Each structure stands twice: as C-alpha cells, then as structure tokens.
C-alpha cells in the first residue's frame, strides 16, 4: 500500500493535469506518522507492529544497485519512511529501545556485504537525539564493539 | 606527498594560531632548503624519462612511476608552503612557477605514457593534496585581486595560462569528490559548512571569470578552444549547483546570498546566465561551440528546479524558453534535445503539453512529408528548433515518450474511477487530452520515420493508445447499464478513432512492412481487441458505433 | 598474567610458532590461564591447523574450566568457528556442555553464558540451522538434555525463519518418546 502511496504521489507531483482534477488526499506515509503521534498514550499493542513494519521497509528497500526515479525514490521514500517512523517511536516508547537499537546493530555488524548506509544514518539521528537514552540500553553497543575487528574500514570509522 | 601536505597545513596552523619557541624554525628552514634544491633538480637527479620509462610491465618502471607521483605531490605541497610564508614575495612566486614547471613536465611525460596504452589507471587523475580552502584563496587572488602591493608579483602567475587551467582542474576535482562520496579528500573535507563556505567563495570567483572576461578573447591556440578557462569555470558552476542541491538543499537561500525568496535571487542570476547564452547564440558563430551552449542549458535546467510553477519568474522562464524554441536554429541534435527536455519538464508542471506535442508533430509532418509522396505540408512556422537531421531521429523519441507518460496518467485515472464505483469533469478532461493526442497521432502516422527504435516505438505507443481506449470502453461497459446512455463527447472520440486513426494505422503497417518481429502483430491484436470491446459496448449501450466505423 | 599479555608488543614476526607450541603445552598443563592465552593466540601468527588442534584441545578440557571464564572461552570457540567445522564443533559443544553441573553464584554466570550465545547466534545465522540439525540428527538416543529445549526456545525467540522448522522438529521429538514431562 505504501509503495503504492509513493507511486501515486510521485505521478501527481510530476504532472499538473492530475493536480487540477484530484483533491489532495492524505498519503499513507503521513497517516502512519499521525498514528505515530497518537501512539503516545496507551498503544503498547500498536508499537510492536510499527517496528516490524519499519525494519521491513528498510530491509526490503535498502539500496542495492550501487553497493533513476522508479527503483530509487519509492524505495528511498519507503526506507526514509522507515527511519522517520522508528526515530519518532524512539522519542516516545521508551521500552522498544534496545529492540530498535539492538536490531539496527544486529543488521549493522555481521552483513557488511549488503549496503547499511541508511542504518548508521538512522543510528546517528537516534543516538544524537538522546544519547542519554542509550545509557538505559548501553550493554547492547559494548557487546557489538567485540565484532569491530572483523569489519570493513568505512563501516568502522563511520 | 601526503606527509608534506600534513606538515605544511600543521605549519600554517602553527603560524596563524599557536604563536598568537625554538622548534618550528628548524622545520621552516628545512622546507626552505628543500625549496631551493628541489628548484635546481631536473630529471637525471631522479633518473626519470631516460633510464626507466615508468612502465606498467617491469618492477623498476613501477618504482619510477610511484616516485614520479610522489614528486608531483611534493611539488604541489611546496607550492602551498611558499605561498603561505609571506605576503606575495616575487622570489617565492618564481619558486612556485619552477615547481609547477617540474610538475607540468612530469604530467606531459606521464600523458605520453598514458597515450601509448589506455587511460585505465585513475592515478594521474588522482587527487591533488592542496586544501579546497587554499584553492578558493588562490583563485580569488589570481583573477579578482587587483591590489598593487600583490599585482607586480602575481602578474608572473597570471601569464602562466597552463597554471590557471591546472588550478581550475584541481577545484573541479574537489567538487567531483564531493559529488561522488559524501565529501572531498584533503583537510577540512569532513565539516560540511566549511566545504559549503569554500564552495560559495569559489562560485563567486568562477562567475566573475565567466561574466567579466568573456569566452571570445581566445589568443592562446586552436587546441585551447575546448580548454578555455571561461568554459572550465562554467563546468564547476554546473557541478557545484548539482552538488549543493543534492547535499545542501536546506541552505540554497544563504548560498545565493553570496552572489526576498529564492525565486527573485535565482531569476536575476538566470537573467545573467540566459543573457550569456543569448549573447553566445546571437554572436552567430559558424564553428559553434555547442559545448558552451550545452553547459548553459544544463546549469539553467539545474537552477530551474527552484522556480515554483506558480511564480511569475517561472512564466518568464517558460516564455523565454519557448521564444528560443521559436527563434534559434542551432544545428546539433544534443543541443536541441537538452533544451526541449527542459521546456517540456517545466511546461507540463504548469499545464498539459498536448498542444505543444501537436504543433511539433505538425512540424515533423511538414519537414519530412508523407508516405504517399502527394501531400504538400509545411508547418515550419511552429518551432524553429526542428531540422532534417534533428527532428527525425531525435525529437520523435522525446515527444512519443511524453505522450506515453500522458497515457500512463489517464490509465491511473481510469483504474481509480473503476475502483471508485468528480465523475463527469474528470472524463471530460480525459477525452480533451485523448482527442488532441488522437489528432497528434493522425499527423504522425502520415510521416516517414527512420527504421531504428523510432518506428517500433511509434507502433508500441499506438498499441498503448488502443490499450487506453480499451480500458476507457471497459469502464464505459461497467457504467453504461447503471446510467443508461454514453456522453456525447465520447461518441465524437469513438467516431474520430474509427474514421481518422485506425485506417491510416493499417496503411502505415503496410508501408513499414513493404520497405526492405513481435510489435506489428501486437498492434493488429490491439486494434482487433479495440474493435471487439467496441462491438460489446455498441451492443450494451443501445447506440450504433459501426456506422462511425467503415 | 601480566607478562603473558605483554607478549605481542615484545615479539617480532619469526619466533611465533615455538611460542605457540609452548603455550598450547602450558594450556594442557594449566586451566587457570586459558583466557589470557587464548587472547594472546588470537593476536600472534599461527597455522589454522594449530588453531583447530588447540580448539579441540581446550574443548576436551571444557568441563574442567571454572565458570567465570567458561563464558569467554565459548565466546572464542564461536568467533573462531569456521563455516565448515560448524556442525562438528557444535556437536562436541552440545555433548560436552551440561547446564546441570555448575549450580546467586551459578545462575548469574549461566545467564552471562546465554547472553554470549545469544550474541554469537544473533550475529551468525549458520549456527542456528546447523545447531538444530545437530539435535535432529541425534534423534537416536531418547536421552537428550536440558540444553536442547532451552536452545530451541531461544532460537524461536531469535531468528524467526526457523520457527516452522523448530515446531516440526519438536513434534517429531515428542511423538518419538524422547521429549516429556520430567
């Protein structure tokens, strides 16, 4: 539905003929993010689905052909939906930290063959936002430092 | 090389910052000794060009090739050092010239040795070690600076034209680095803001050299006409603008405040760029540097991404572009192609282009003529950038691809309208586009295209046209029992598709097949499917659509 | 402990092999100095064959290790595992380990153990499928141990490609009269 979202919106924006006719309908991207604002209160049951979702967006539509609009933008926008979700969640659901974090790192460390640029970009924003919030989940980093010997150089430095 | 770059950057930092005791002077005078002895060195001190030919066959050639690249980097770092000591000493500029002459000697030797074999090593187009900070400084000093205390001593560096093209090559390589990676190589190529600040300063410099000194001052040589400094600065301009849109989209306003919203800023800059292009064009050069023209339309295309489609400057842009399309001939396929690309891209995000598509097809049908050699048509009045060698191979592909995009958009509309069952005005606009596209194809089918990708693409798009008509009549099959009757505008469309398009489709299939695998069977399959679904509709609509058919 | 750990800054690149020999000879001699030795030997230059020999050599001695190090030793075995020896080494470990002998004291140290495993198996997929083949392939003996349940649970909790695979295996096991109440 979300790929579909982005195809629709891309086609509209490249094209005024459709912009004259169609009323600007909210896009699935924007709706999900509004779920994510509304999530705050009492929605322990919703968040565990979000995470599943976002890592599915990034895992499926992470870059690959360098390791164009059609293979790039509704993957870029898919992936970059992913990150926005999981940053936004990591602000407010303080118990699915170490489950975002630990899964980021889990896809960081071992692969080093699939491009993971997007994931460290995520990780930078995540930590930057509140690193004080990773001193509530710290062991998961320091146990990922033990694999730093086996990693390509850009990976490690970055 | 890389060691020395670190030393002299360290040493510049030690001058500027640390002093505002008895150690740095050691390294200074070491460096000054290296300067004077590296000056009076020449090529049999390093046994170069004569005893080892730097060959990628032997180990000793490899040793001397590695040595030569080390030398070239050493030359450049000591250039930076001799510049960094003083306020514009004559003697230090003589040293810099001597070092560059050594470097340039080595480069033109290695170029002969990369002229015997291919340019498969990316090791002579490897980085300079000069800071981008430095080169920005250097180019401001070379071109714009006219302070008489520095002029006498810089006028020897100005006279080296070779030195200036080296300098702009360096700056271009930093820009190319920033595009390809996230960042450039040397020092302060990891803080983006410092890189941004040095870009802006460079941009001002290269504008000045572009704008102040024209290109029609060529008193160097006829090998230097693809190598003008006024061209190289514009190449950077293009790459800078792309690079800063790509990486630094949230600072374009403070980027233009170097040279009120982004629109007015950019409009006055465009005015200067498009005047540059106008005066380039209006010179009426028979040799015609299409290179210079291509870079002007490339930069205008890069910049035109920041005009809003509701701005008056947008409409100024569009009117200006359409004027150049209606005036200026300029016989080179890629020139026409780039301009047409920009115009269409801008146009369609303001309104549908199907009028412009129709007029271009009228020009194609004018210039080429017909299949039957008894239709005298000429509509050269419509668009000046349409020639015998341009519009037949090249413009056709673009106008048909644009038409394919139109058909994708109406397909999306038709799909969404089927799924829905705001009703009437949607289909009215759809049939307006489709009617004018149908007259467009009526003009195209009459023409004689070349036998490459063009003819099969025309047949493929006409298969897409019949597929869109099939989807149209399928939605009409869905709706015609519920409402009861067909709208009158659709009845005119199906009359025009029966009468105008389909007979001449068959005639063009016969014309392409007579002159001496899958697409022509696919077109006749598509046209018979169109007829079949039209039979279904004419039965299930209580209207006789075969009296409109022949 | 101090001087040993100081060995690689000291030595050049020649007299490595004899040190290797002597240290493995000390390793069969003394159990106290596994950890710092194993650290050293990952830092010096050895034949792969020698690594594998010392591996089998530590693991025979695997019951014979005080708990505290037990973590870091398995840490070693499973960073040091190749792709190909995977199922043997797992089989040996699977045999030799207990989760019964050890037992505030026992539980904390065991917990660390399972963390170390979680890491190893989180970050390397082939251990999981190989691990289950190494219980599934030991369908024979009705007598299979605590480890094996604990480990299926764990892998279900982690990599989820295997869930169906675990379930069929856990059914085939239960119906077969291995796996039971006690």
Automatic annotation (TrEMBL), chain A:
Residues 46-158 form the FANCI solenoid domain. It comes from the Eukaryota. This is Fanconi anemia, complementation group I. It comes from Homo sapiens. The lineage of its organism: Eukaryota, Metazoa, Chordata, Craniata, Vertebrata. The chain holds residues 333 to 498 of 1328 of the full protein.
